[PDB]
Design a protein around this nucleic acid. Structure first.
Lengths: 70, 135, 74, 64, 88
RNA sequence: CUUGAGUCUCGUAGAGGGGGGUAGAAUUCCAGGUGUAGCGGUGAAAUGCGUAGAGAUCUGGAGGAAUACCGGUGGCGAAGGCGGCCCCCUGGACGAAGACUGACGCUCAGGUGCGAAAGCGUGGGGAGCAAACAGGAUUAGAUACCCUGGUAGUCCACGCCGUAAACGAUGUCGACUUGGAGGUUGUGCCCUUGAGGCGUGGCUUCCGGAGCUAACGCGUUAAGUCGACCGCCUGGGGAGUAC
């Protein structure tokens, strides 16, 4: 959660980018769930198909770059 | 026969009672037409966690060519010995043509690369002296 | 001319030549986190073949109780 | 709760702390901030959440 | 299952030529010596169905090269059964 | 006859298998200290846990299950599948080069073995999770989702019928073959062309001309072209049910 740190008694230094171990972190996917040998890579491709709002904006950035129209 | 390398450990109380052991093991392997390709003492080392409720133990390394039944017999003897407190064994191995190559990394473990559960100052007065210009 | 300026563990024969060993604990310190975890290929400047060798040496050294293996210790 | 805990040890004449943290809950920094601001001395922050090497099977709640 | 020096000793004094590694007979002598060791492996490693499948592949091939040798001449085929001891 | 096919030498990567061992990390449980009235569970709680001393925090002890990182559309296995570290034994693959044998080859009905999970007979074991069972809540109801509680089961040894969206959905094997990029990995030669490159050989992810193409697309590892052999279909229900 808070690690040990180069930070000045962090609650006052607005670092947020790395400061978890499990807590909304990627290892929470089989933590508090069954084991599933296959699921977690299938579940990237499946999640993304419904996650269309982020998908389509990255898709638009790269195809518009790729045409020399950007 | 096969080329080997062996690590083993004994207590801190036994870190000056190990040379009588290194004699006996040598004489077992030379007794078997086997040879010492390298010999090193890593001394008392601090442990990232205490083994048998003590934060240090004393490490040794032998590197040999020996018949496989010597090393069958001896790895199991250690695994039944209570003074010999942990080992690792590796198959198909030789020494470096450098002398003391692992000693320079012993020096590094004892300095920067453990969690020092008992003080650095008592365990570092053990085994091979870290003459870093040989190794 | 001969020889030209090589990249990290690249273009050359006498670096990373043999497998990355667990006794060479001095190199292993370079490649581990502050919780004693392995660092991947994408950061170390090495390929799949070397990473397999690195992650083995790190493992070996940790089960020898000589290297950190979590943020916690006693 | 952090202020009520500062008051809880007030009588032992303690003032100096360092800090250790565990658990997923959000009581992890608002606590420290109001603790240091309630006449106590924070000095260090370290996490002590226990993590496994894989371990035993997790519970399932709400089919999650 | 065979040592490299054992394989070498097989072709030392079998094989139809200097540096023969291909003759029917020596293929089947080395397959016998593999089978006899690998049967004795899977004897204690009873759940090793990798080695079981490798053992099967060897005795099948050896039977097909015995059949190839009986297709050439039957007297050298039964001479190899003599020289390897196989079956009752 | 050596070219298909096979074999040894030799280079080589691998979570391939079976047998055994081991270190540390953690969830749990027991004892006891310290401390003192709270804790918990949900949308809300209720059920439940506490002052007969909880929760939280410290230290000693105990069990059983599993290997965080690494990790990749990556690597390996006949497929099913295979993921901590050490030893022992062990199948398979691939590849620069050496040769050798001398079409010895290929498929395959039936047959024989394997075959995720659930299952079940047998004995052992009982940390965690959790069919069943027990209680709570919700709701019009709730025999359900949801929560409190939890046995069997799993895990270990032995044995049994075997089934799966055993969905990489495309029978096995071979030849013929548009193009390109990524990853992975064997190799000869060399200014390691710069970066190692380059040819070359193996796997694989992605893209795609033409072809094929109800259609999605697929697309040289074809959902292509061509051959041998082998399996399946023939409107829907009755029904893989009955006998």
């Amino acid at each position: 959660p808070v690690i040990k740190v180069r930070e000045n008694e962090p609650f006052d230094v607005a670092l947020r980018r790395f400061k978890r171990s499990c807590e909304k972190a990627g290892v929470l996917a089989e933590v508090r769930r069954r084991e599933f040998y296959e699921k977690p890579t299938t579940e990237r491709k499946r999640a993304k198909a419904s996650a269309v709002k982020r998908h389509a904006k990255k898709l638009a950035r790269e195809n518009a770059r790729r045409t020399r129209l950007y | 026969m096969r080329h080997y390398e062996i690590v083993f450990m004994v207590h801190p109380d036994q870190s000056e009672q190990v040379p009588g052991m290194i004699e006996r093991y040598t004489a077992a392997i030379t007794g078997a037409e086997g040879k010492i390709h390298r010999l090193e003492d890593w001394g008392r080392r601090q442990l990232a966690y205490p083994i048998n409720k003590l934060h240090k133990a004393h490490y040794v390394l032998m590197n040999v060519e020996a018949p496989q039944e010597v090393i069958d017999e001896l790895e199991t003897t250690f695994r039944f010995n209570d003074a010999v407190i942990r080992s690792m064994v590796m198959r198909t191995k030789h020494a470096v043509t450098e002398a003391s190559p692992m000693v320079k990394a012993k020096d590094e473990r004892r300095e920067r690369r453990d969690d020092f559960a008992n003080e650095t100052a008592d365990d570092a007065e053990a085994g091979d002296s870290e003459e870093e210009e040989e190794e | 001319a001969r020889y030209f300026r090589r990249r990290k563990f690249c273009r050359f024969t006498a670096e990373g030549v043999q497998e990355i060993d667990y006794k060479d604990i001095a190199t292993l310190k370079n490649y581990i986190t502050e919780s004693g975890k392995i660092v991947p290929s994408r950061i170390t400047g090495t390929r799949a073949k070397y990473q397999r060798q690195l992650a083995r040496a790190i493992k070996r050294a940790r089960y020898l109780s000589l290297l950190p293996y979590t943020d916690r210790h006693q | 709760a952090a202020e009520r805990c500062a008051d809880a040890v007030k009588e032992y004449g303690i003032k100096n702390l360092e800090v250790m943290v565990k658990g997923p809950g959000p009581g992890r920094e608002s606590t420290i901030r109001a603790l240091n601001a309630a006449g106590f001395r924070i000095t260090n922050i370290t996490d002590v959440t226990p993590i496994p090497h894989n371990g035993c099977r997790p519970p399932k709640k709400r089919r999650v | 299952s065979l040592s490299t020096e054992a394989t070498a000793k097989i072709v030392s004094e079998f094989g139809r030529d200097a540096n023969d590694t291909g003759s029917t007979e020596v293929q089947v002598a080395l397959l016998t010596a593999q089978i006899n060791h690998l049967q004795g492996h899977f004897a204690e490693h009873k759940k090793d169905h990798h080695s079981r499948r490798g053992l099967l592949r060897m005795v099948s091939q050896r039977r097909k090269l015995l059949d190839y040798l009986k297709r050439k001449d039957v007297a050298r085929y039964t001479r190899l059964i003599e020289r390897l001891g196989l079956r009752r």
